[PDB]
């Protein structure tokens, strides 16, 4: 790893917490196998090198031809929180702070444009499908030069040293969590809340990046809860009320459907590649005593039903294609978690009206939120559209209807919608 930092600022070397007089302007420290050497080649230019013996960044195990030590976004990640840590402090705490030999605060010395360059970075992902780097879309200061294969070189521009350095670390942490090292792709459990703040120390990171970092980097429900407020507070400052949740929309969904419906009434699964089924005998845990009905137009699903009945565990599973093969005349809980928009449009009203005739106790329906699509990178309803749909088929009857959204919430808008129709 090789990292040059420029500015025309006279007090650069000051800001980086380094003394140009001390041992020729070198600052050394062991990294892993190891040795990281910071270098004042002058003011106006600092040069971090990372040497290595062997296997500092890619397991000795891999019988591979290893060169991560020379370009892994992680070496950068370390070099930040090990040479330039105070630089990555915080908006308030940094700008308003003394200097070793004061000439006012940081807000006075660090006002000169800073350029920082990486000789060799490695980005093996969708976020660098060749030509360009995906964060270039969202940060105009990032400058890529391809070298070969998945390797590139970085040049980071900033109005301040703080601005520049906090982008490099944003690059490093986003690039790393979206990157496969191949079989050795791994993230420790202490990773989040060692870097989780980098996403909050640069000022226009999109919501999708936060989601990504939550789902790929925060290993423990316990630790998600400790970062959750830092994230949310950041988005408040940026002008968005965002809830955030560890579990992932799906399944965060499946969770909701389970806890709501409960095990006391036989299920009628409407759109099913079978996953809702399994979930309903999570071992004995839910001592599910009833049979279990499923339907689907898909020939493919029709057949898979039977592949479980020739036979693996499909003991109380009854699957039907024609709707007059369903004869069960007792109370049922009933499920529609995609289905209504996956397609079959406005026959969607036909389908659900059919259900409301069927002796049920509780229904749940689910569709994408649409107002959510802004937040990422076969029709689709807004809640007004959806709420209108429920209305004009459940209408004029004595059914109790209750709404709620599932998944991360941004200004009241989740990415998934749900109704719970309860017959009195």
């Amino acid at each position: 790893m090789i990292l040059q930092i420029h500015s025309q600022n006279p007090h650069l070397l000051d800001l980086l917490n380094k003394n140009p007089h001390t041992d020729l302007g070198i600052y050394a420290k062991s990294l892993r196998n190891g040795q990281l050497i910071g270098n004042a080649v002058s003011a106006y230019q600092y040069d971090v090198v990372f040497q290595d013996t062997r296997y500092s960044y890619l397991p000795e195990e891999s019988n591979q031809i290893d060169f991560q030590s020379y370009c892994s976004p992680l070496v950068i990640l370390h070099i930040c929180n090990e040479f330039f840590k105070e630089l990555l402090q915080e908006k308030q705490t940094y700008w308003s702070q003394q200097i070793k030999w004061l000439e006012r605060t940081r807000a006075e010395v660090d006002t000169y444009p800073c350029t920082i360059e990486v000789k060799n970075l490695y980005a093996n992902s969708t976020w660098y499908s060749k030509g360009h780097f995906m964060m270039e879309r969202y940060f105009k200061n990032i400058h890529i030069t391809p070298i070969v294969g998945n390797n590139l070189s970085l040049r980071v521009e900033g109005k301040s040293v703080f601005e520049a350095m906090n982008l490099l670390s944003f690059i490093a942490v986003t690039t790393h969590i979206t990157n496969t090292y191949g079989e050795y792709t791994y993230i420790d459990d202490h990773f989040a809340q060692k870097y989780a703040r980098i996403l909050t120390n640069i000022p226009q990171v999109p919501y999708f990046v936060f989601y990504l970092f939550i789902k790929r980097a925060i290993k423990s429900e316990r630790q998600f809860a400790e970062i959750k407020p830092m994230f949310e507070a950041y988005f408040k400052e940026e002008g968005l009320d965002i809830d955030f949740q560890f579990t992932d929309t799906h399944g965060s969904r499946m969770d909701f459907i389970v806890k709501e419906l409960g095990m006391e009434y036989p299920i009628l699964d409407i759109g099913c590649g079978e996953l809702k089924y399994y979930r309903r005998f999570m071992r004995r845990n839910y001592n599910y005593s009833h049979p279990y009905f499923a339907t689907d137009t898909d020939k493919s699903v029709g057949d898979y039903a039977a592949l479980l009945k020739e036979r693996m565990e499909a003991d109380n599973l009854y699957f039907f294609s024609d709707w007059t093969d369903y004869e069960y005349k007792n109370p049922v809980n009933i499920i529609l978690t995609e289905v209504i928009e996956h397609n079959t449009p406005e026959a969607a009203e036909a389908l659900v009206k059919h259900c409301l005739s069927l002796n049920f106790h509780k229904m749940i329906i689910t569709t994408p939120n649409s107002l959510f699509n802004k937040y990422y990178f076969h029709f689709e309803w807004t809640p007004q559209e959806f709420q209108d749909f429920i209305r004009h088929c459940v209408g004029d009857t004595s059914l109790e209807v209750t709404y709620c959204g599932i998944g991360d919430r941004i200004n009241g808008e989740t990415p998934t919608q749900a109704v719970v129709i309860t017959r009195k």
Binding site: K309, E310, R311, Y318, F319
Partner: protein, 291 residues
């Protein structure tokens, strides 16, 4: 109907030696999911030998093959079976023995005799006379056609009860020493049948596999729990022949043609079979037998 309902499968490989059925099966059980192979030849290899044996051994090998297949089929395990058999008397029998337990299927392995003896034997063609048509045969039951025996309905209504282990549980007692039999405990549900039995015109006949020598300790047990009975039929003293033999004699000599048996209550299988299978009479089985 309308409903889905599945039973395990029995796949009968039918064919000559060298025709490649054991090869298919090795591939099959290794790639399919829930299957167990049963080979007759592998069996007679526990008994050490080349693949024909004493009519004693081969009858015993049959007893084992059948037990195991049923054992597994009952367990919902699919069974492939390596029929060296190949005949018709075998096949049709094979089918009889099995279909009721599972859905039978067939896979033939035909192969030119010029090619067949090139799997190196004994130059001998087999009964391959494409008979029967090897169409798959779903599970069949045969028996809800219950048909008793034509007993003279003039003779007086009567029921029949076993003592040992049916109206009179042992509670530890030695099976063959029914001297201590006045300590025995009452299987009340049976006792309750015999009660309501004699409330209608029914003669209640006790028929027991006890040495007649133990008659006294028995009548004690009976009057102790207030059992209202007409006859008490007992095994001859020093007899010792099997239960069903001595009970059947007892039945034909006494009960038969003098009474009209409305049903019987008994415990052990050996006897239940006789009643049902030989004498063609309704017999209810009170507990589990298999002594």
């Amino acid at each position: 109907k309308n409903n889905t309902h599945h039973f395990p499968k029995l796949l009968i490989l039918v064919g000559a030696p060298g025709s490649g059925k054991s090869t298919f099966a090795r591939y099959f059980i290794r790639t399919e999911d829930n299957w167990v192979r049963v080979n007759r030849d592998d069996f007679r290899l526990m008994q050490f030998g080349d693949s024909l044996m004493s009519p004693f051994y081969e009858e015993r090998i049959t007893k084992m093959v059948e037990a195991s297949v049923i054992a597994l089929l009952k367990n919902r395990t699919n069974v492939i079976i390596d029929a060296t058999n190949s005949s018709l008397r075998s096949l049709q029998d094979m089918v009889h023995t099995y279909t009721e337990y599972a859905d039978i299927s067939f896979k033939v392995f035909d192969l030119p005799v010029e090619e067949l003896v090139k799997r190196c034997h004994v130059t001998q063609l087999q009964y391959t006379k494409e008979k029967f048509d090897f169409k798959p045969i779903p599970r069949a039951l045969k028996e809800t056609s219950l048909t008793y025996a034509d007993q003279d309905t003039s003779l007086p209504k009567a029921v029949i009860c076993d003592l040992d282990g049916t109206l009179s549980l042992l509670n530890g007692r030695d099976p063959y020493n029914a001297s201590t039999a006045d300590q025995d405990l009452l299987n009340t549900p049976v006792a309750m049948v015999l009660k309501m039995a004699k409330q209608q015109g029914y003669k209640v006949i006790l028929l027991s596999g006890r040495e007649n020598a133990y008659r006294e300790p028995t009548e004690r047990f009976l009057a102790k729990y207030q059992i209202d009975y007409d006859l008490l039929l007992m095994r001859d003293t020093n007899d010792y022949r099997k239960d069903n033999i001595i009970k059947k004699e007892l039945f034909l000599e006494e009960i038969q043609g003098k009474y009209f048996v409305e049903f019987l209550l008994d415990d052990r299988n050996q006897v239940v079979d006789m009643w049902r299978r030989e004498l063609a009479l309704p017999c209810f089985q009170v507990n589990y037998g298999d002594f």
